[PDB]
């Protein structure tokens, strides 16, 4: 897995009596100077490989029938290997910052209690919980608009309840058409106000809108902000509106897009986390992630063979929150399925244990490369609920560029679709066709997955965020890194190649209670589940 020499590569690509072409010589020279660079920075060493990989397929593009090509395709694979080598030999401990994000509303006690677990166990880490002091009223506003649409949709249902295909499917379809119109009425309002006075604060536009159009009480809203700001200050609150240099004005624009217009706090958070990791360095976590459990704790307790590796890891946590009681309310439903003598095997190991540090594994020194961003896995796929990156890392720029490039395709096609259409149905048809007209082999999948963007948060199985700002943008970045590209969208990296970038697994417990629920999306089950409730709030009332 060592990178071949000039002379060694020459053996590989040797064709008897063939002229040494300029494009070939160029490759060999450049490979020579890479091996005479060993003092340089990792990033600089990566960039030299990237030029070497560009000179190589220039050769291949030039001589498509050259008897050198086979060997040179293999060379390209060794370049890929060399990246992993540079990565694996450039590890260094991350900045000891620990990031969380809660925006668009008041932080709940459930999040703070999960966060506090991290704080207690990591003295040497600066816990920062980013919030947006200008935007406490996003969730409120969406809750009101969604509310109004639900109701209107249900009034056009008051004599069709029992059948036929007025099921939960038709409810969302038709609710969405109303949500879109109402949402657009607000956006148009917000946008005209910002033209008026650019200094205007998001929440101030929001309250004026809520009081004028939906009869909300000004005072109640100002007290909600005041409380929300109070709570988060009390809890290591870092206001983003206080920071100066961080702002990538492009990212800020898209951060604002997801926060104010789309009301996707998860998307907004996807955007803010990578920006903060880049500027600050460290470890990012979702507020529903708990720390890793100490290896040796339950090592002497053998997993009952009829029980999954997953449920056991899940029990391991519930066992902690039964006896030690760090989080009040934490489920033990799975723990109670166990045999008495095994339940007492857990009481036994949790007996002679003093500090929370002997229970949860502290993060300590986490080693990472400048060339990478480490990421959590769930079900043999990356998931960005947990990230690690050095300040100003190369791969963070790749991630940020993936986001921008994807939003450029989105916005360039969506914005005019918004302007040309006269309702939800027409906008979606214009958007769908515009993406069709510019779709090809290398982006078709991406186009399909972002087609339903305007539906995010309002309808079941809507997953566009994943491929704009979430996991997809990381696997995209990893393909950029390994394959030497800047445009990766058609993914060909398999799990074991993606596993190079994994969050160290012993240093996180992903399988918590709060993770079971999602706040930006929902599946078909929950959709049906709460169609019943909304409907059942029409016979049951005051």
Ligand X SMILES: O=c1ccn([C@@H]2O[C@H](COP(=O)(O)OP(=O)(O)O[C@H]3O[C@H](CO)[C@@H](O)[C@H](O)[C@H]3O)[C@@H](O)[C@H]2O)c(=O)[nH]1
Binding-site positions: 101-103, 139, 265-270, 286-288, 515, 518-520
Stretch that binds ligand X, among 222-230, 304-312, 391-399, 465-473 (CB under 6 A): 465-473
Q: Between the CA of residue 231 and those of 287, 288, 324, what are the distances in Å? A: 15, 18, 26
At 432, list the tokens.
């769908």
Within 88-163, strands assigned E span 92-93, 97-101, 126-131
Question: Among Mn ion, ligand X, none, what binds residue 269 when CB lies within 5 to 8 Å by partner kind?
Answer: ligand X
Is 518 a binder of ligand X (CB under 6 A)? Answer: yes
| C-beta nearest to ligand X: residue | 470
CA distance 454 to 383: 23
State the DSSP string of 456-497.
TTTSTT--THHHHTSHHHHHHHHHHHHHT-S---S----HHH
Is 287 a binder of ligand X (CB under 6 A)? Answer: yes
Q: Which of 288, 318, 480, 513 binds Mn ion (CB under 5 A)?
A: 288
Neighbours of 92 (CB within 10 A): 12
Among 512, 523, 183, residue whose Cα is nearest residue 315: 512
Q: Which of 30, 210, 338, 466 binds ligand X (CB under 6 A)?
A: 466
Evaluate whether 387 touches 373 at the Cβ level (below 8 Å): yes
Q: Is the dihedral of CA 278, 279, 282, 288 positive or negative?
A: negative
- Residues comprising the binding site for Mg(2+)? 288, 515, 518
Is 284 a binder of ligand X (CB under 6 A)? Answer: no
Is 266 a binder of ligand X (CB under 6 A)? Answer: yes
Report which secondary-structure segment, H or E, holds 173: helix 168-196
**Nearest approach, Cβ of residue 253 and ligand X (Å):** 18
Closer to Mn ion by Cβ: residue 220 or 234: 220
Tell me the chain's radius of gyration from C-alpha atoms: 27
Is 104 a binder of ligand X (CB under 6 A)? Answer: yes
Evaluate whether 338 touches 368 at the Cβ level (below 8 Å): no
Is 291 a binder of ligand X (CB under 6 A)? Answer: no
Among 477, 228, 243, residue whose Cα is nearest residue 255: 243
Closer to ligand X by Cβ: residue 90 or 514: 514
Residue count, binding to Mn ion (CB under 5 A) = 4
- Residues comprising the binding site for UDP-alpha-D-glucose? 101-103, 139, 265-270, 286-288, 518-520
Is 101 a binder of ligand X (CB under 6 A)? Answer: yes
CA distance 469 to 406: 8
Among 322, 297, 469, residue whose Cα is nearest residue 399: 469
Residue count, binding to ligand X (CB under 6 A) = 25
- Residues 397-417: b if buried by 16+ CB within 10 A, e if exposed: bbbbbbbebbbebbeebbeeb
**Nearest approach, Cβ of residue 376 and Mn ion (Å):** 10
Q: Which of 13, 103, 135, 259 binds ligand X (CB under 6 A)?
A: 103
Evaluate whether 87 touches 500 at the Cβ level (below 8 Å): yes
Closer to ligand X by Cβ: residue 271 or 293: 271
Q: Between the CA of residue 307 and those of 313, 333, 335, 337, 338, what are the distances in Å? A: 10, 14, 12, 11, 10
Is 288 a binder of ligand X (CB under 6 A)? Answer: yes
**Nearest approach, Cβ of residue 108 and ligand X (Å):** 9
**Nearest approach, Cβ of residue 404 and ligand X (Å):** 16
Is 270 a binder of Mn ion (CB under 5 A)? Answer: no
**Nearest approach, Cβ of residue 376 and ligand X (Å):** 8
Is 513 a binder of Mn ion (CB under 5 A)? Answer: no
Is 203 a binder of ligand X (CB under 6 A)? Answer: no
Stretch that binds ligand X, among 18-26, 181-189, 266-274, 361-369 (CB under 6 A): 266-274
**Beta pairing partners, 127:** 98
**Nearest approach, Cβ of residue 503 and ligand X (Å):** 12
**Nearest approach, Cβ of residue 49 and ligand X (Å):** 31
**Nearest approach, Cβ of residue 366 and ligand X (Å):** 19
Neighbours of 444 (CB within 10 A): 14
Question: Among ligand X, Mn ion, none, what binds residue 280 when CB lies within 5 to 8 Å by partner kind?
Answer: Mn ion
Closer to ligand X by Cβ: residue 282 or 470: 470
CA distance 170 to 424: 15
Stretch that binds ligand X, among 1-9, 284-292, 429-437, 496-504 (CB under 6 A): 284-292
Question: Among Mn ion, ligand X, none, what binds residue 105 when CB lies within 5 to 8 Å by partner kind?
Answer: ligand X
* Helix (H/G/I), strand (E/B), else coil: 380: coil
Q: Which of 212, 226, 519, 537 binds ligand X (CB under 6 A)?
A: 519
Q: Is the dihedral of CA 330, 333, 336, 337 positive or negative?
A: negative
Sites of contact with ligand X (CB under 6 A): 101-105, 139, 265-267, 269-270, 286-288, 383-385, 465-466, 469-470, 518-521
């Amino acid at each position: 897995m060592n990178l071949v020499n000039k002379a060694q590569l020459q053996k590989m690509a040797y064709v008897k009596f063939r002229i040494q072409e300029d494009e070939y010589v160029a490759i060999l020279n450049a490979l020579e100077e890479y091996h005479n660079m060993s003092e340089s920075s990792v990033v600089e060493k990566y960039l030299k490989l990237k030029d070497i990989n560009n000179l190589t397929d220039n050769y291949l593009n030039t001589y498509k029938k050259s008897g050198r090509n086979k060997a040179l395709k293999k060379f390209k694979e060794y370049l890929t290997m060399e990246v992993l080598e540079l990565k694996n030999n450039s590890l260094t401990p991350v900045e000891k910052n620990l990031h969380f994000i809660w925006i668009g509303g008041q932080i709940n006690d459930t999040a703070i209690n999960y966060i506090n677990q991290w704080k207690d166990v990591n003295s040497d880490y600066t816990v920062k919980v980013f919030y947006d002091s200008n935007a406490f009223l996003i969730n409120t506003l969406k809750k009101t608009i969604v509310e109004s649409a639900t109701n209107n949709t249900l009034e056009s249902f008051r004599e069709n309840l029992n059948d036929p295909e007025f099921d939960y499917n038709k409810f969302y379809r038709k609710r969405m058409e109303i949500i879109y119109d109402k949402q657009k009425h607000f956006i148009d309002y917000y946008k005209s106000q910002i033209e008026e006075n650019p200094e205007f604060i998001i929440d101030n536009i929001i309250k004026t809108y809520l009081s004028n159009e939906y009869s909300k009480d000004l005072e109640a809203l100002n007290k909600y902000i005041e409380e929300s700001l109070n709570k988060i200050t009390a809890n290591n609150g870092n206001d983003i509106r206080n920071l100066e240099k961080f702002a990538d004005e492009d990212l800020v624009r898209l951060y604002n897009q997801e926060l104010v217009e789309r009301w996707n706090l998860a998307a907004a958070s996807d955007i803010l986390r990578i920006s903060m990791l880049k500027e600050d360095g460290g470890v990012y976590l979702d507020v529903d992630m708990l720390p890793g459990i100490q290896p040796d704790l339950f090592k002497s307790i053998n997993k009952p063979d009829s029980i999954t590796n997953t449920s056991w890891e899940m029990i391991k946590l519930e066992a902690i929150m039964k006896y030690k009681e760090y989080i009040p309310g934490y489920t033990s439903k799975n723990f109670d399925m166990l045999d008495e003598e095994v339940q007492r095997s857990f009481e036994s190991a949790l007996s002679s244990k003093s500090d929370k540090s002997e229970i949860f594994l502290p993060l300590d020194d986490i080693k990472v490369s400048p060339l990478e961003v480490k990421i959590a896995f769930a079900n043999n796929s990356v998931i960005n609920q947990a990230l690690i990156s050095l300040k100003d890392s190369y791969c963070s720029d790749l991630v940020i560029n993936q986001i921008k490039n994807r939003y450029k395709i989105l916005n360039d096609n969506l914005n005019p679709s918004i302007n040309e259409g006269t309702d939800f149905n027409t906008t979606m048809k214009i958007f769908s066709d515009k993406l069709a007209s510019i779709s090809n082999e290398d982006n078709m999948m991406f186009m399909i997955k972002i087609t339903n963007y305007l539906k995010v948060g309002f309808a079941p199985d809507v997953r566009s965020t994943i491929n704009l700002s979430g996991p997809g943008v990381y696997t995209g970045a990893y393909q950029d890194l390994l394959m030497f590209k800047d445009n990766s969208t058609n993914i060909h990296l398999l799990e074991p190649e993606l596993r190079n970038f994994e969050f160290p697994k012993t240093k996180i417990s992903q399988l918590t209670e709060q993770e079971i629920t999602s706040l930006w999306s929902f599946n078909q089950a929950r959709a049906k589940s709460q169609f019943e409730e909304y409907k059942k709030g029409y016979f049951e009332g005051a």
